[PDB]
Design a protein around this ligand. Structure first.
Ligand SMILES: *Cc1c(COP(=O)(O)O)cnc(C)c1O
Ligand SMILES: *Cc1c(COP(=O)(O)O)cnc(C)c1O
Ligand SMILES: O=C(O)CCCCc1ccccc1
Ligand SMILES: O=C(O)CCCCc1ccccc1
Lengths: 388, 394
């Protein structure tokens, strides 16, 4: 039977990792001055504390632990968290949350379609194709200005109908690095409540843009306006626990009844897929979030990380400017997050990796965290050489 | 939109515990638990597991994304733990999963990909979650006879007669050992006949191995699996580390796809990695790394096998004790099956109505299909359970 298995297409980023004076600017992970993805101080201390506190490993919560559910909701929605109308499900990372999100929605609407940003995280489309869900795209990135084509984005969203879902990146847009301003979010919230489109928000980098609270701004704004929203959150990057596989899905409902339904359907969704969700990472998160000392240090370390990358973008932007006189690559300093699409054509990007030894995703997505004072001028010179 | 969503029934475990906690009787007993509990009513963390967690705590330097289909240390160690020397790396595809359940679901996804018109035969009875996952996937589900309510043993003739109807490409689900919920298992000889039926029918076997080490031993419990693995070219195995390693909440397991040749292994392995990727991307590291540590570190592997064996001997003596008590109470050897059952579970063969009477009259709680958890017994509880059984006329 297994011989009928058709060969499946590889994931670009994972494959890029395969093809890797080498410069790793591919996969979206934070790296320090010495090319390492360290473990956060609070995370380590949490784990040490867990080693002493835990006395059992019996089956726990089917939808995650109360502490994880509550601490995550507060971190995301702040004071906009209305427990009585909010359903929470602990999942296997953000990706698990996204998949569970699409499953929940499709159960509620067998005829749903999903709009995604042009461009968006490749894995978004793969999951949707696999489930067989109709994918539509809304303009978002502006090829020329490297910013957001907001006039076009609004145009496309207006075509969304009731029952459709619109996937929005809460902050730090992957792969572009181009992000909406709170003013732009308020307008989208207007369109959404006119169309009736259910918004699904991919919150994977809360803390890498402008700050823990600031990066959650747009999400809090949508949640305040739209009576029903879905948020797929990830603790992989902002907590640096990538391999622990921890995130969660929040279902904001209009009332307690609808909320009770969702919560039930969410628990069931976990039961029929893998039973209980992974505990270790979730426990690290809540332990950090509910322990003032730990939370304080974590916030501090995350701030240091978000600050450093900001400094790097400026160095890089400057390096390029002085390397060409033109302030064309200014968009790099304007972008926010870990990625930024250089705009290099497919034929140019290949030159870079084969000759310059610098590996960046084929669509010119560079993980700014992969740069440093030593490699920045090299990258700058490298792309100047590649010209047009 | 979410208001449409149809009401999804609870996990039922909570309902079982619900009425139990509400019971105002100081001497109430709970044999409905689905986890191991030592003499003091606790589900302890195995010494080796705690040893592994400290070592990981001192040696892990990063938490970056690792293996999509799991880490090599885990895949190899697990395949060895299961298939022993019979492990053929060349034709074996492995996938780290989110517990045994994740393994079962991934196995069904993989199978359905290769054969859309797949049907699945499950035992009668079998782990409820089997049925629910299948129903949710929309797969056709057939049943083959298994438990014999009269002898509490395996109705093998019935099993064979029904399994004979399986067609080429159909999937037959087998519990490799310690059949949950029955406790009634196949002797190595019966396993050999099952293999014959499978070769004949061309059905693909899916073996659910969640209790390796809880029956007659690590190797002994893997016998049925190894027999099938050597005679059948394609076998799917969904292992669990939840119970035998005591890391339930860690969610550790794996799917092994035994193929007829390398080219096919490359096909299956690719499809498995794809299934992880499309469901939740990377699998959970912590538990799988605890496992590959105990298994590769001689000192720890030693202490783990010792602890598991102690637990095995312990539950086994409990069975002998319960059956001994039952013998003296009934004046017959009717309940001898309890000493012959293997695993932590056992279906007494009591009707739902007899089950209710026991609860009300004796304060003893158990699953509604009369499944009890051997680990819940002890020198004080056994005399009461024994008397209850006789008293309610089981
Ligand atoms: C990281 C990320 C996710 C989720 O990753 P997980 O490893 O599954 O936590 C989802 N979407 C985007 C855009 C991401 O960058
Ligand atoms: C426990 C169990 C499983 C798997 O459990 P996980 O906790 O998901 O690892 C599978 N089958 C049976 C029969 C079980 O008892
Ligand atoms: O680098 C990124 O795009 C962020 C996420 C990286 C991890 C990831 C890569 C491929 C598929 C799933 C998850
Ligand atoms: O059936 C049993 O009692 C053993 C497993 C019980 C807990 C469990 C419930 C759902 C999915 C996986 C595991």
């Amino acid at each position: 039977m297994l011989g009928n298995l058709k060969p499946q297409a590889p994931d670009k980023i994972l494959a890029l990792m395969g093809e890797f004076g080498k410069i790793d600017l591919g996969v979206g992970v934070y790296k320090d001055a010495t090319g390492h993805t360290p473990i956060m101080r609070a995370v380590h201390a949490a784990e040490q504390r867990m080693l002493e506190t835990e006395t059992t490993k019996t089956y726990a919560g089917l939808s995650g632990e109360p502490e994880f559910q509550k601490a995550m909701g507060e971190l995301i929605l702040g004071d906009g968290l209305k427990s009585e109308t909010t359903a929470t499900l602990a999942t296997v990372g953000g990706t698990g949350a996204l998949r569970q999100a699409l499953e929940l929605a499709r159960m509620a609407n067998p005829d749903l379609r999903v709009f995604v940003s042009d461009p968006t995280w490749p894995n978004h489309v793969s999951i949707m194709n696999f489930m067989g869900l109709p994918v539509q795209t809304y303009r978002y990135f502006d090829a020329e200005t490297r910013g957001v084509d907001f006039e076009g984005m609004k145009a496309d969203l207006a075509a969304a109908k009731k029952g459709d879902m619109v996937l929005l990146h809460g902050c730090c847009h992957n792969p572009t690095g181009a992000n909406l301003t709170l003013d732009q979010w308020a307008e989208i919230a207007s369109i959404l409540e006119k169309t009736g489109a259910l918004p699904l928000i991919d919150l994977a980098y809360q803390g890498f843009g402008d700050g823990l609270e600031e990066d959650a701004a747009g999400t809090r704004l949508i949640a305040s306006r739209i009576p029903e929203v879905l948020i797929a959150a990830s603790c992989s990057k902002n907590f640096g626990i990538y391999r622990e596989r921890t995130g969660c899905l929040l279902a904001l409902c209009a009332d307690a009844a609808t909320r009770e339904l969702a919560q039930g359907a969410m628990a069931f969704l976990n039961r029929q897929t893998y039973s209980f969700p992974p505990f270790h990472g979730a426990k690290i998160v809540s332990t950090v979030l509910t322990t003032p000392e730990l939370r304080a240090d974590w916030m501090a370390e995350l701030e240091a990380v978000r600050s450093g990358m900001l400094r790097l973008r400026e160095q890089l932007a400057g390096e390029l400017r002085d390397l060409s006189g033109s302030d064309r690559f200014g968009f790099v300093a304007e972008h926010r997050g870990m990625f930024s699409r250089l705009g290099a054509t497919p034929e140019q990007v290949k030159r870079i990796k084969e000759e310059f030894g610098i590996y960046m995703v084929g669509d010119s997505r560079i993980n700014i965290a992969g740069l440093n004072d030593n490699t920045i001028p090299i990258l700058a010179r490298a792309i100047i050489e590649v010209g047009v």
